[PDB]
């Protein structure tokens, strides 16, 4: 489906597979703001581990996405960014403050027990 | 006639927002703003969890989600929809449900609820 | 064009009600016991203080008065102004103040405001 | 053919469903309750009727029937009705939303605590 | 037409009742079995088929899907089956000899003991 | 190719979000165990809560994967049966013991956690 | 003159009467310096209670006076403000952070004089 | 060469960087965040102690002190000179020297140095 | 280019050794006791784990083994390679991690890590 299904103990655990287009990304933001409508969970983690390429068209839709699901009330992490990626989307130039991105996936559910739920 | 709404707890004071969404209703504001003062009202909350679009000029609620501030404690507006957060062409609380935002209006004046 | 909001502060569902002297406006007879079942509400608060005047039926009024009670649990009238009571042309519990009878329905489902 | 109602029995306080059946030949089950009100010992018991809907004109063969219980032994209690079933009430008694919780106040009624 | 055979909702364990239904063609006591297994949850749940006679030869559609509710509903169990009605043996699931002491052991598999 | 994985720490919550054929399931299936012996796995968490309709070449895999993970070193647990899929299992040789089925992917951390650890 | 500061120990209260002139603001914004400069403050409470409106030009003044109070060394309190100037001050560039507003004189010092060393 | 300076102590570890204030050496940008993914480093130091100057391109140093705010966590510059701090064309934590730039990075892992 | 490691947290001493397996470059025994009594470095290592492989060139560096034993203080040598102890044409302190090299140092001079 390019989308997972995803729940997780009163947070989310959003996989994102190896993808190339914003013709996938613009349903995308709907298809994960569809379930944290009724799901009432007070966290998502996207996980970007398997990309290895954003251009710079897509890299505002997960440029926006942390701080759109924050608006709906759900903090948002970004876990496994790669240093490919992670070079290029700084030229899109970012003011990412309340992004709280860990290192793996088993360390980014550590970071939402601390701040949901202490 | 044109008159929305208000409720008042008095500890925090509340409103719900209904389905009105034109600008010619700036009165949402002016409704608001007059017992912010005349009763001490310290926190509130929006609460437009139904609601279809705003049109695309909200600096008639995101700013008066800011001049609440100058006038009392904070503000935390209750369940944004779909097509709301979709579109951003602009900060705020911005908690998930009513059930919710009424825990943390009593921890951010420092009360609970338990027996 | 109809419009009788409500809110749900995590056990009771309150409803709210501005000046509808009107019997056109028959939906909240129904409008409230439909969502009064579909999430579990206890107790219903009705917080009818903005309301000028009843004109010669309250019976609508009454009625689900008496429905919520053998349907699921005691109803509160809130601050019934007092040019309105005198029309008497003719039981349950009531209040004087928004800010108060919402204490005492918590009393009546034993919890409590802390600290 | 259906002269079959419904019944059931758990620990002491009892119940007894209701499915649909809007007829007036439902005097069964004004008798049938009442027979194992006293065959067993049930102390109180339940209506369950979450799903009836719906009644035509006759309380009196669904509510004097919750005033015998009260005589034979105790205290019967309507569990939940429909919004557009009372929505008509040109007509007191205990009455509750669902079953989860209104065998809660059941065990209180006859001192029990399900608690661990 | 008599669109119903039973079911109940009460408090986790989400007990059933069955009446003399004894014909192949009451199939309808699946899948209203199964929707409600995910409607809510249900940890345990109960069958009280303590008024059947008899099974003709087809255990296949009431002992076959107890371990297919296995997959979802966590160890159903037999609640009060009558004499005559074990004599049909072709050739397992837990069961009691009726629902007030069927419902405290269902009661143990949930953290729930009965206290006064 | 379309069905990922993820890890928690001594744990595999694996998904399933729609299956067509033996191929695309013995890539996954093929993925499983690869991904069973490259970490170190304890207990894998499959969820299928998105399956329409199974036959007999599929629902034998899916059968059977409770045996292969469970030489392998690690229990398992299929979270998420749907009512539809599951009366379609009649046909097979019930061997399903110790398979510890679960309601959804909350109660399989429950029903795990239980096995191992706190 | 007209703008009488005085002392209440560590604390400097004010007001403000009924205003209509430009000329007050200039003649205001030295005094509210001088004697916080003599007076060792630490916190300065401002009650602008009865002003109706306050124009654009004056807003500015009393808008820079809370950095310039807070620049010298005492966390500046603006407390008592009638609502219907509020709306005059959206248009305004406002970024009141740490500006710390209240409602009335008792929410002045229930505030700040509990946010300053007590 | 290519595989120009670092190394890999306890778990928040540091990196080092020795006279070379050339453009070309963009290696220094990409050779240590292969390292990021490579082990979960947390927390890592810079330690430019020695170089004069950085002359108009901190792009490779100042935005790679960005990417592991993004990667893992809190990087910090350890004792830049009297002369490169007056050089600013244009934030983080930093420190002064690498025994007091350790031990307040052990305070955002957690542990500490003394017995 | 002919400077390898300034380098110290300054109770004890890092080191790193990265590329350079020739007889040429003798500077890191000299300027390496330089900086060893230029401050109070008690212990030292070396950490050669990227060197593949030493030629002829232990009788320079095992002399810098046999200079901080009469120096200051048990210097210790990290992760040397497969093929590296290989070579024997003929002692010290020896481990294989960084990571937990330090705590052998930390250990001989009576330092611990809590948490």
Redesign the interface.
Known sequence: ?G???L???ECL?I?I?SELDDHTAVEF??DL??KI?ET?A?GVVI?IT?IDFIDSFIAKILG?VV????????KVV?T????AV??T??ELGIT?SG?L???????G?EKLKQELGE | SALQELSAPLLPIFEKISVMPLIGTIDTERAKLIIENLLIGVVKNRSEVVLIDITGVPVVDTMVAHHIIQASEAVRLVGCQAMLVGIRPEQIITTNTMKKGMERALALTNREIVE
């Open positions: 489906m989308i997972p299904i729940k997780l103990g655990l996989s597979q933001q709907e703001l569809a409508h009432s007070r996980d398997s926006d701080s759109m699901s924050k608006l709906m009330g759900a970004v496994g960014i790669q240093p992670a070079i989307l700084i990412f992004v991105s860990a290192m793996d996936l088993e360390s559910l």
